[PDB]
Amino acid sequence: FDVVYVDREYPVSSNNLNVFFEIGERNSFSGLLINEGQAVIDVLLLKKSTGIQLSAGQILKFYNVPIAEIIVEYDPSNVSGVSSNVKLKGTIHPLFEVPSQISIENFQPTENYLIYSGFGTSLPQTYTIPANGYLIISITNTSTGNIGQITLTIGSTTMTFNLQTGENKIPVIAGTQITNMTLTSSSAILIYEEVI
Numbered sequence: 001f002d003v004v005y006v007d008r009e010y011p012v013s014s015n016n017l018n019v020f021f022e023i024g025e026r027n028s029f030s031g032l033l034i035n036e037g038q039a040v041i042d043v044l045l046l047k048k049s050t051g052i053q054l055s056a057g058q059i060l061k062f063y064n065v066p067i068a069e070i071i072v073e074y075d076p077s078n079v080s081g082v083s084s085n086v087k088l089k090g091t092i093h094p095l096f097e098v099p100s101q102i103s104i105e106n107f108q109p110t111e112n113y114l115i116y117s118g119f120g121t122s123l124p125q126t127y128t129i130p131a132n133g134y135l136i137i138s139i140t141n142t143s144t145g146n147i148g149q150i151t152l153t154i155g156s157t158t159m160t161f162n163l164q165t166g167e168n169k170i171p172v173i174a175g176t177q178i179t180n181m182t183l184t185s186s187s188a189i190l191i192y193e194e195v196i
Contacts, residue, residue: 001093001094002093002094003091003092003093004091004092004093005091005092006029006031006088006089006090006091006092007088007089008021008087008088008089009036009085009086009087009088010072010085010086011083011084011085011086012037012039012041012072012073012074012083012084012085012086013039013074013081013082013083013084014074014078014080014081014083015083016074016083017073017074018071018072018073018074019071019072019086020069020070020071021069021070021071021072021088022049022068022069023067023068023069023070023092024049024068024092025048025049025068026094026095027066027067027068027092027093027094027095028064028065028066028067028092028093028094028095028096028100029062029065029067029070029090029091029092030062030063030064030065030090030091030093031061031062031088031089031090031091032059032060032061032062032087032088032089032090033054033059033060033062033070033072033086033087033088034059034060034086034087034088034089034107035054035055035056035057035058035059035060035084035086036057036084036085036086036087036107037056037057037082037083037084037085037086038056038082038083038084039056039074039075039078039082039083039084040053040054040055040056040075040077040078040082041053041054041072041073041074041075041084041086042054042072042073042074042075043060043070043071043072043073044069044070044071044072044073045065045067045069045070045102046067046068046069046070046071047066047067047068048068048069049068049069051073052102052104053075054104056082056084057106057107057108058104058105058106058107059104059105059106059107060102060103060104061102061103061104061105062090062101062102063099063100063101063102064095064096064098064099064100064101065100065101065102066095066100070088072086108196109196110194110195110196111194111195111196112136112192112193112194112195113130113131113192113193113195114191114192115127115129115135115178115191115192115193116178116189116190116191117189117190117191118189119186119187119188119189120183120186120187120189121148121182121183121184121185121186121187122180122181122182122183123178123180123181123189126177126178126179126180127177127178127191128175128176128177128178129172129173129174129175129176129177129178129193130174130193130195131174131193131195132172132173132174132195133171133172133193133194133195133196134169134170134171134172134193134194135152135169135170135171135172135176135178135191135192135193136167136168136169136190136191136192136193136194137150137163137167137168137170137181137189137190137191138166138167138168138188138189138190138191139163139164139165139166139168139183139187139188139189140165140187140188140189141165141183141185141187141188142185143165143185144165144166145164145165146162146163146164146184147163147164147165147183147184147185147187148163148181148182148183148184149161149162149163149181149182150163150168150178150180150181151178151179151180151181152170152172152176152177152178152179153176153177153179154172154173154175154176154177158179163181163183165187169194172193178191
């Protein structure tokens with residue numbers, strides 16, 4: 001069989017109303033169309049060269065979908081001045097003898113904020129958590145199970161945690177202090193926050 005790789009992004013706004021993507025006649029597409037931004041978009045999937053309205057941040061997933069053309073349009077109901085970066089990524093290949101499917105999901109990108117890297121049994125100072133999110137304390141050690149203790153303070157509240165080898169995931173509010181950590185043997189330590 002033959003495969004064509006698709007990696008495209010186009011702005012869609014009042015200034016860029018339409019994108020026409022040719023997939024071609026005897027072909028199937030597997031991949032993603034990503035509405036990265038604030039413009040609602042209308043997606044027409046045409047078997048030869050019914051629209052799907054994608055709201056801000058939505059992703060249209062394709063598996064083995066026989067399409068000859070994908071048309072993307074700025075929806076006329078948009079608040080003026082909104083735009084999106086519309087990304088098409090995937091593979092064009094022949095129609096496989098398996099189900100053809102689409103699905104849609106909301107994307108919420110996550111970003112990791114480093115707090116501490118080291119290798120030892122405690123922290124060298126206190127740290128402030130910058131945002132609402134999830135604090136990740138990764139402790140690497142030869143043994144499994146219990147590996148030490150961490151103390152967080154937030155306002156007039158103190159919290160102490162039974163740290164395990166591996167990834168420890170704690171929901172945290174912005175401004176929370178990492179006041180101390182004590183491990184029972186020297187370990188690779190990586191502390192960061194998952195933020196949305």
